[PDB]
Design a protein around this nucleic acid. Structure first.
Lengths: 365, 108
RNA sequence: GAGGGUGCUUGUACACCCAUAGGGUGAGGUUAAGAAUUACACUCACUAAGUGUGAACAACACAUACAACUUGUGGGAUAUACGCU
């Protein structure tokens, strides 16, 4: 059977369910330590999965030897004394064990070793640098760690343990959207994948990869929706005699450029601000515009893609076609304004995943 | 609003007997004045009714150069086109003694 | 008045407040000067923000409308402000 689901991720805010401040602070400091150990881990794994391939290259330049990544107990040309993922997991666990859990290590190991084999093609020739993982990384945790999930009606919040620590979940005023999603797991009805966790300065967030299913509508494959995307009109869609124009040049491009201009304004004004206390306090005002316009662009892109999908479904357009998109990509590539002010890859990927969810088949030409 | 689907007013011009028309007032000019005022009121009422009918078939097409053929709107406009004109309806109302008139100066 | 805090996350606006927050400071290194003292886009860090209960800078309860809600990780690339010639 084919994959009847499309992967999906949700953000759930979590508070530490403890009575006093000091225990909460101890847990939060432990989790910050978990972040630091995870990032140092990711660095260790990527270095340790770079070096051995170059040892292979060294041997091949020595005598053309056919050394390959395999256990020597199972391969004559193998050099490894165990499975490669085991080698990385060992060389990180032997140093970072006893401080942060090992499921984080397993999830990170899988997540990097899966991608590095695909990147082997770009790494033998050389067009990609070894990743240098950040410090604010959302660290990953597998489904083998979620435990004691229940709905405590007394505190009006779901309770669970993220590796031996209580956690009251803060849906807030979300009594419908994700409310029947965690209950869909406490009763064993929805599948969950290896999730991640973020912490952004006092608040705690869980990036849960819930595996959601497709939605079947009454769609006609013969009916075709003609979609075009431009910087003056973000979406213009034909469906027989029905026209829909989604987005305005002022609400997408002009506000984006206004945020950019405000950022440049603060950058200019930070040169002569309070001085002598370091660069960080000078760039404090710049730090406000961290992901401002990215968030704005993402929200407007979500709204526009949702309106496009709603229009296509409401008119039973079973095939959505992007007109002349290849040529517009070509012109955007050989420009500056069009690439750095018209997010078309983000729009295209949102449309693709929101139409593969609804059954609409998307064509580009 | 009177029943516009069963009106007996002539669609086109007819030779109306003046003696019947001005019998109630004794002056055909006064009758014409009263009928014209009632015709203005009837035209206002018909315009309101037609606008209400047309607001239903308000197909939101942003394009302006292209000519749009909405069958329902054309049908409604055709229905209201073949009706007797407001002055004809006012004349029919007047001959049937369905017009109320009064003189403010004379009543003061 | 921008910008913000609480009102699950995002956007808009919204009530209540903070807001000279593009500020008020603390420490370490360094530099200059006879000294006071100044200096650093040198480094690190602290400090403001709904209502009620509550001795309380403890904890708990309550707190607006519409739309959206598949993200995270990394690489390549471009540009902005600053510093030097």
């Amino acid at each position: 059977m084919g994959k009847s689901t499309l992967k999906h991720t949700r953000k759930i805010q979590i508070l530490i369910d403890l009575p006093t401040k000091d225990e909460k602070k101890e847990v939060m400091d432990m989790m910050y330590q978990w972040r630091d150990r995870c990032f140092r881990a990711a660095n260790i794994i990527v270095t340790h999965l770079y070096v051995q391939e170059m040892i292979k290259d060294f041997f091949y330049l020595s005598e053309g030897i056919k050394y390959k990544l395999a256990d020597e107990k199972k391969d004559e040309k193998g050099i490894l004394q165990r499975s490669r993922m085991n080698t990385t997991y060992r060389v990180v666990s032997d140093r970072f064990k006893g401080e942060m859990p090992t499921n984080i290590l397993s999830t990170l190991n899988h997540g990097l070793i899966s991608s590095f084999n695909k990147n082997r093609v770009q790494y033998w020739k050389g067009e990609r640098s070894l990743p240098n993982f950040k410090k604010d990384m959302a660290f990953p945790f597998g489904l083998q760690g979620i435990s004691r999930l229940v709905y405590d009606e007394e505190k009006k919040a779901f309770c669970f343990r993220l590796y031996r620590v209580p956690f009251k979940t803060y849906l807030g005023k979300d009594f419908t959207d994700k409310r029947m999603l965690l209950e869909r797991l406490v009763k064993g009805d929805v599948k969950l994948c290896a999730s991640n966790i973020q912490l952004n300065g006092g608040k705690i967030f869980w990036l849960a990869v819930f595996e959601i299913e497709k939605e079947k509508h009454s769609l006609k494959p013969e009916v075709i929706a003609e979609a075009s995307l431009s910087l003056e009109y973000p979406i213009v869609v034909k469906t027989g005699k029905n026209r829909l124009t989604i987005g305005t040049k002022e609400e997408f491009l002009y506000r984006r450029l206004a945020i950019q201009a405000a950022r440049r304004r603060t950058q200019v004004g930070a040169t002569y601000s309070r001085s002598g206390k370091g660069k960080k306090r000078k760039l404090k005002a710049v730090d406000k515009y961290h992901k401002t316009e990215s968030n704005y662009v993402a929200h407007r892109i979500h709204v526009y893609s949702r309106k496009l999908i709603d229009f296509c479904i409401k008119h039973q357009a079973g095939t959505l076609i992007l007109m002349n998109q290849e040529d517009k990509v070509g012109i955007a590539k050989e420009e500056e304004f069009v690439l750095r002010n018209w997010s078309y890859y983000e729009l295209m990927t949102k449309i693709k995943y929101k139409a593969e969810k609804a059954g609409i088949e998307l064509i580009i030409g | 609003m009177q029943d516009l689907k069963n009106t007996k007013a002539p669609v086109s011009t007819a030779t109306l007997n003046r003696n019947e028309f001005d019998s109630k007032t004794g002056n055909i000019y006064e009758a014409i004045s009263i009928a014209s005022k009632r015709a203005v009121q009837i035209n206002s009422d018909i315009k309101k009714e037609l606008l209400e009918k047309l607001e239903e078939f308000a197909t939101y097409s942003d394009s302006l150069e292209e000519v749009f053929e909405n069958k329902e709107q054309i049908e409604v406009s055709k229905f209201y086109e073949k009706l007797p004109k407001p002055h004809a309806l006012a004349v029919q109302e007047w001959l049937e003694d369905k017009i109320y008139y009064r003189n403010t100066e004379k009543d003061a």
